[PDB]
Design a protein around this ligand. Structure first.
Ligand code: U5T
Ligand code: NAG
Length: 350
């Protein structure tokens, strides 16, 4: 199990002002550290955050967090469940800031909620340095869904933080799972771009510096979209993305209720998969199966899906080798080309 530590700096808080924190399982003798960012959508105004506080309070508060959590999938310490990094130091960072890990605003006289996701990551890293992270060779910042977008938004800041703190030997890398979204037109016409734009102002949200300099003031929402922020990043980032991610379809107002799919929706879905595949063409480390699903890396059966005969744990291992010219039998760019969900036979059964 991973054990809860609430942040010693209690000014770095979840939405309701309770301390943020992290769950840790150390593996002495390993110099690999996996820091995983939980997902869970976001909220962007007082009214929708108040509703989230009523019925999704664990995503806004640490007051009810359990003392331990079981590491699953890529956070498992069992080689059978985690062929990739089972011996690593494991860190699960709960998502309690509702800001896609972008916020740097405290609760105050003018703010009902604190949005501190970017500062939570920074503070977790700082406190871990005294618990063995100072001796690390690789820090893999991973995350799923909103946490996967959080990786894209924060990996270079973690790298810069460690450089400035005097740890230039720690190699910071990112693993963004299910956080690579398209700002596309809905199938039927709140929306991702508008919600993010409102969120950034409400959260005092921050984006990576090079991306911010490209898009400039008022346009920072662009940096929440993988295909726009990824080319600006310096740290190596492996992108895991279902071609037909359920969250993407949800924001696109697509719901597949078994009934036969007619031409307009068929074309819409096929073009979405084509667009996603296009955005990954120049992402050398990627795993993008043609499945309708959501998230992958912390589920216990994450080992089962394969693209072109290669599983994600294998692809991640090949990526590790590449970061020591392509490797014989050890590919890292794995994007399905077939055009309809479940054309890959290894897709999750749901
Ligand atoms: C720009 C953007 C940023 C984040 C999301 C997003 N974050 C999610 C978190 C989630 C849901 N379930 N779980 C376990 C986690 C999500 O589904 O979509 C979507 C967009 C368009
Ligand atoms: C605690 O966190 C706040 C917010 O990031 C920061 O301003 C402050 O310097 C931190 N305190 C210490 C002792 O690190």
């Amino acid at each position: 199990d991973l054990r809860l530590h609430l942040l010693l700096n209690t000014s770095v808080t979840c939405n309701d002002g309770s301390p943020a924190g992290y769950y840790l399982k150390e593996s002495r003798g390993s110099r690999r550290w996996l820091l995983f960012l939980e997902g869970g959508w976001y909220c962007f105004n007082r009214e929708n955050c108040d509703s989230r506080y009523d019925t999704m309070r664990r995503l806004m508060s640490s007051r009810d967090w359990p003392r331990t959590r079981t590491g699953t999938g890529i956070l498992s310490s069992q080689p059978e469940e985690n062929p990739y990094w089972w011996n690593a130091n494991m860190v699960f960072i709960p998502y309690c800031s509702s800001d896609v890990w972008s916020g740097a605003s405290s609760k105050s006289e003018k703010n009902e909620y604190a949005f501190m996701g970017a500062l939570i990551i920074q503070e977790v890293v700082r406190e871990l340095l005294g618990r063995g992270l100072s001796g690390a060779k690789v820090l893999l910042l991973a995350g799923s869904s909103a946490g996967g977008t959080g990786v894209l938004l924060n990996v270079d800041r973690v790298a810069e933080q460690l450089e400035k703190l005097g740890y230039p030997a720690i190699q910071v890398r990112g693993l963004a799972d299910s956080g690579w979204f398209l700002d596309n037109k809905q199938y039927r016409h709140c929306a991702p771009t508008e919600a993010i734009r409102r969120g950034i102002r409400y959260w005092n949200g921050v984006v990576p510096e090079r991306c911010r300099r490209q898009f400039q003031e008022g346009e920072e929402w662009n940096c929440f979209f993988g295909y726009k922020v990824y080319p600006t990043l310096r740290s190596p980032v492996f992108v895991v993305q279902w071609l037909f991610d359920e969250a993407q379809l949800t924001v696109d107002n697509v719901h597949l209720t078994g009934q036969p799919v007619q031409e307009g929706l068929r074309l819409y879905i096929q073009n979405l998969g084509r667009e996603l595949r296009h955005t990954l063409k120049d992402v050398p480390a990627s795993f993008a199966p043609a499945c309708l699903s959501h998230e992958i890396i912390i589920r216990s059966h994450w080992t089962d899906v394969q693209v072109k005969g290669t599983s994600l744990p294998r692809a991640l291992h090949c990526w590790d080798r590449s970061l020591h010219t392509p490797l014989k039998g050890c590919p890292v760019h794995l994007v399905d080309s077939c055009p309809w969900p479940h054309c890959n036979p290894s897709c999750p059964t749901g």
